[PDB]
Amino acid sequence: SLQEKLLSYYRNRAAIPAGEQARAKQAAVDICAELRSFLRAKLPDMPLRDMYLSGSLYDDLQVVTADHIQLIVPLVLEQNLWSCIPGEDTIMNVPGFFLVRRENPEYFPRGSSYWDRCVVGGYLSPKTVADTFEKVVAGSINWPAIGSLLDYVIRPAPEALTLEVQYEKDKHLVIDFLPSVTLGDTVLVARPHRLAQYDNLWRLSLRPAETARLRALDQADSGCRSLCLKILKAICKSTPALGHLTASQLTNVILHLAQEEADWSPDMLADRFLQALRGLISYLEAGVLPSALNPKVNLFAELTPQEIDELGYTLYCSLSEPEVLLQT
């Protein structure tokens, strides 16, 4: 049966071996803790708060192998000196991103905020904020040295700025930094749009609300929504042609399906999984996967029409190839 096959798959492929999981988490926590001590007394005029961990590995949603996690770098934008403008209301015309503008320059002149140094054309540029972070914060740190204080080999990549942390003989955790600001209840991260011309836009952070929703639905049920997600994530991670699919896209297929099916008991796993499959296919066919949290946002918007067709073509072929889809 498909039910057995899926549970077998989760167990032999999707589920991260516990030792691996524990050691990767420990290295992240230990590095985050050491950075907290180190940075606390270092950049006294910078509105910088403690870095903190975020991502599927932190949430028990990472699959196959523990290989990555984020350190969010929370920055403070002072009261009433800043506003965010939704992307769809800018000429850039992209929902799910925001411009951040310096407000009241005419009364609290350029110079008033620490972040004025990262202001360009009146806007707080996420790439200039990220450059400042890398040069001023990350740069003040000897990475291989901290790994030596802790007992890890830490290698900063020369390529986007990430840390490769060997936590096991032949296993490494890749850590990347996400500068973040919050305006009202709008949480923004500097993860650039795929294309350069959009590099002035901060990205709206969806993950915390997405994963909260998913968890809250399963707690109430108590359903197999997260198990289904982890399985689909493992298939995509394990299939190169499915490389363009993200955890957010898969999570939102499941959240939409949650509006249509209330019953996610353990024995419904197979039916829901197949539903999630045909559903993902139909969104690809439509070229649009609306965010379950903010339906103005199209989660496929950074993919090209050709990429979207290739994904759908791949999934259709997979239906007749359960053995490759469910390796190993």
Ligand X SMILES: Nc1ncnc2c1ncn2[C@@H]1O[C@H](COP(=O)(O)OP(=O)(O)O)[C@@H](O)[C@H]1O
By CB under 8 A, name the binding residues for a second copy.
Answer: 36, 39-41, 44-50, 52, 74, 76-81, 104, 107-109, 111-114, 181-184, 187
49 contacts 32 by C-beta, under 8 angstroms: no
Pick from 179, 255, 201: nearest CA to 223: 255
> Shortest approach of a second copy to residue 84 CB, angstroms?
12
Q: Is residue 225 annotated as involved in ligand binding?
A: no
Q: Is residue 191 annotated as involved in ligand binding?
A: no
The CB-side HSE value for 206 (13 A sphere, CA atoms) comes to 23
Residues 71 and 57: their CA atoms lie apart, in Å, by: 12
> Shortest approach of ligand X to residue 251 CB, angstroms?
7
> Shortest approach of ligand X to residue 60 CB, angstroms?
10
C-beta of 18 vs 41, nearer to a second copy: 41
> Shortest approach of ligand X to residue 265 CB, angstroms?
25
Q: Is residue 207 annotated as involved in ligand binding?
A: yes
> Shortest approach of a second copy to residue 79 CB, angstroms?
4
Which of the choices ligand X, a second copy, none does residue 194 contact, using the CB cut-off of 5 to 8 A by kind?
none
Q: Is residue 68 annotated as involved in ligand binding?
A: yes
Q: Is residue 54 annotated as involved in ligand binding?
A: yes
Helix residue ranges per DSSP H, the chain: 2-9, 18-40, 56-59, 126-132, 143-149, 207-221, 225-238, 247-260, 269-286, 305-318, 322-325
CA 321 to chain centre: 30
Pick from 1, 8, 27, 9: nearest CA to 237: 9
Which of the choices a second copy, ligand X, none does residue 90 contact, using the CB cut-off of 5 to 8 A by kind?
none
Backbone angles phi, psi at 205, to 5 degrees: -80, 120
> Shortest approach of a second copy to residue 102 CB, angstroms?
12
Binding site for ligand X (CB under 6 A): 54-56, 61-62, 70, 72, 178, 189, 191, 205, 207-208, 233, 247
Q: Is residue 172 annotated as involved in ligand binding?
A: no
Q: Residue 267 corresponds to which tokens in the numbers above? A: 């024995």
Which of the choices a second copy, ligand X, none does residue 28 contact, using the CB cut-off of 5 to 8 A by kind?
none
132 contacts 181 by C-beta, under 8 angstroms: no
The CA–CA distances, whole Å, from 169 to 62, 67, 148, 165, 287 equal: 20, 13, 16, 11, 43
Which of the choices a second copy, ligand X, none does residue 55 contact, using the CB cut-off of 5 to 8 A by kind?
ligand X
Give the Cβ contact number of residue 252 at 10 Å.
25
Give the Cβ contact number of residue 273 at 10 Å.
22
C-beta of 36 vs 110, nearer to ligand X: 36
Amino acid at 30: D
Which of the choices ligand X, a second copy, none does residue 56 contact, using the CB cut-off of 5 to 8 A by kind?
ligand X
C-beta of 44 vs 240, nearer to a second copy: 44
Which of the choices a second copy, ligand X, none does residue 247 contact, using the CB cut-off of 5 to 8 A by kind?
ligand X
Which of the choices ligand X, a second copy, none does residue 182 contact, using the CB cut-off of 5 to 8 A by kind?
a second copy
Angle, CA of 168, 169 and 174, to the nearest 5°: 50
> Shortest approach of a second copy to residue 76 CB, angstroms?
5
C-beta of 93 vs 140, nearer to a second copy: 140
List residues forming the annotated binding site.
54, 56, 68, 205, 207, 233
List residues forming the annotated binding site for ADP.
54, 56, 68, 205, 207, 233
